[PDB]
Every structure is written in structure tokens, then in C-alpha cells.
Structure 1
Amino acid sequence: SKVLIVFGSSTGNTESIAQKLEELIAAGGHEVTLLNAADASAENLADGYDAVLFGCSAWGMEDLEMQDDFLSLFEEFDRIGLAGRKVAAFASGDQEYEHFCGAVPAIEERAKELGATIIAEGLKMEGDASNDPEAVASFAEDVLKQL
């Protein structure tokens, strides 16, 4: 299958998770494309892809604010071509906050509104990929099986 992975990462934790995810799905016999949302042109970005995974950390002093490289892409979800495609979200976050990885539910809702199907429950964890390999491995499992 063809899998597209796009992320927005400020310190590198959501990046780390998106690279591990690329490795695990690619290992399953699938073609993975990895993009930093800061580099990606949204226009028809999903065309060709059987699933699309979105990674994005949560910030904001008060309410939830998305990582800014993702956000800019989030604005353009309308042109991506998500209708009838499979999608899932992941993120790095901090339990010590009220809205743990709040970007994840947010992505899932925008995606469903645009006609996407949610493949697996959003991955929510702390630190980089090495900090919770199980959580990463399992989320990749969930994804693989829906492909």
C-alpha cells in the first residue's frame, strides 16, 4: 500500500515518532513517503495514497495551539484530497498539561469532516519514539492491519 506521513515538530519529538513509523510500515511491505509539513505543498497531496498519517505537537499558553509548520498545512486540508481515504493521527505531548496531545483529536475531526475514515485511535505519548517504543509499535500495528 501507499502511505504518506506528514508532521509538524518544534523540538523533534513528533519527528522522531514519524521516522519510526515510516520504518515500521515500510517494513510491512508498503511504500512510505515522509514529509515535514513545512516542506509540503498541500495541493492534491493525498492523491495516490491509501492512508495518511498526521503528526503534530500541541502548544499555546492558554487554549490549544498547533505546531506552526503543521498549522499552515492544516489551513489547507481542503485541497489535500482526503475524501474516502484512510487517516490516523499521532503526537508527542506532556501529561502535565490539561489537553494531552490535543492536536490529535483536532486532526481526526477535521479529517472526518473532509470525508476521511479514521484507521486507528490517535497515538498520544510523551518524549521521542525511544521513550515509548511499545506505544509507537502498537499504533503502527493498528495502522498496518487496516491497510
Structure 2
Amino acid sequence: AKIGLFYGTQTGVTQTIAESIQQEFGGESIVDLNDIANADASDLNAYDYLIIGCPTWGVGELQSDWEGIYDDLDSVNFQGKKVAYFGAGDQVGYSDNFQDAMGILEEKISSLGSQTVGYWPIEGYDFNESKAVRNNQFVGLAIDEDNQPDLTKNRIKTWVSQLKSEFGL
């Protein structure tokens, strides 16, 4: 497929979101779903457009599978690639570290010459601090199944619609 979606998940929520994103884009013919747990960093080279999904765990840390491949990101040719991000988090329980993992990945990947695409507004959330916030916006789609599960479907629908422009669709 033209778009490669790489996600990591601990309790399965992020995988469910990844599947919904794939569906909104039009299915398997448009977006490839790849669990980062089973991927080599080089797998990310095969796509010109990437979607990176990662939930935040351990109080402001990356999900373990993303943590494992983090050091190899440096060897990937990210130059000129457009990359979008999404993450699952809990704004009530972790108000000071909401969506930090998504922020950690974007900071690293954007520093390797890629172009971040898919900024999202922070106004629909209530949190104190987040490493995923840049200039009053999230670097990607923030999903909260723990406190706002009823907003998930429309958030994905809206975000994908916005992404289609950026990915030449």
C-alpha cells in the first residue's frame, strides 16, 4: 500500500484505533497495518507516507515495543517523508504526561528530516502537561478511550479526512 501504519500496543486499544484508521482510509489496498513488535526499522523505508501509533505507558514513557526499536530509528531514511502520529492516553489519570509517547516519537522522527503532518487541536481535552504539544497543538491525533470513548469515532473520521489531502488522496 502507499501508506504504512506502524503501531505498538500493550492492552490492545492502539491496535483497535489503527484498524479504524485503516478502515476510514479505504482498507488494505490503501493502508498497510504493521505491528512494530514484528518489524525491523528498515521496514519503515518502504513507504513515502507513514502513520505512527503509540500509547503512553509507565508515566510518560513509550510503549515497550516502540522503546525497543527507538535506537534504530536513526538508520531509517526519513528524509522528505511525510509522517502523521496518533496515540492513546488517559488525560484524567495522567494529566501531567498525557500522550507523552507520541510527543517523544515525533521529536525524534522529525529531527531526522521528515515532515510532520496531521496537527490536532488541544481544546477538546483537559490536561496539564504533554510532550506532544507544540505551539498550542498536538503533533497528532490524541485518542482517550478511558475518558472520552464516545468521541473516538468522529475524531478518527475527521483526522483521516484531513490527512487525505496531505497524502495525495
TM-score grouping bracket, smaller chain normalisation: 0.7 to 0.9
Pairing 1:83-94 to 2, within 5 Å after superposition? 83-94=79-90
Q: SS at 1:103's partner residue?
A: helix
TM-score (norm 1): 0.87
Q: Given the two structures, how large is their TM-score scaled by the length of structure 2?
A: 0.77
- The higher radius of gyration belongs to 2
Matched, 1:113 2:111: yes
Aligned residues between the structures: 143
Using the TM superposition, give the Cα deviation of residue 102 of structure 1 relative to its aligned residue in structure 2, in angstroms.
Answer: 1.0
Which segments of 5 or more consecutive residues in structure 1 lack a partner in the other structure?
none
Matched, 1:81 2:77: yes
Where do 1:24-103 residues align within 5 Å? 24-26=24-26, 31-43=30-42, 45-61=43-59, 64-96=60-92, 97=94, 98-103=96-101
Structure 2, unaligned runs of 5 or more: 120-139
In 1, distance between residues paired with 2:6 and 2:74? 15
% identity of equivalent residues: 28
| CA distance in 2 between partners of 1:80 and 1:4 (Å) | 14
Q: Secondary structure at the match of 1:46?
A: helix
Tell me which amino acid in the other structure corresponds to 2:109: A
RMSD: 2.1
Q: How far did residue 89 of structure 1 move? A: 0.8
- Alpha-carbon offset, residue 48 of structure 1: 3.7
- Deviation at 1:30? 5.9
Which one scores higher on RCO, CA 8 angstroms, separation ≥ 6?
1
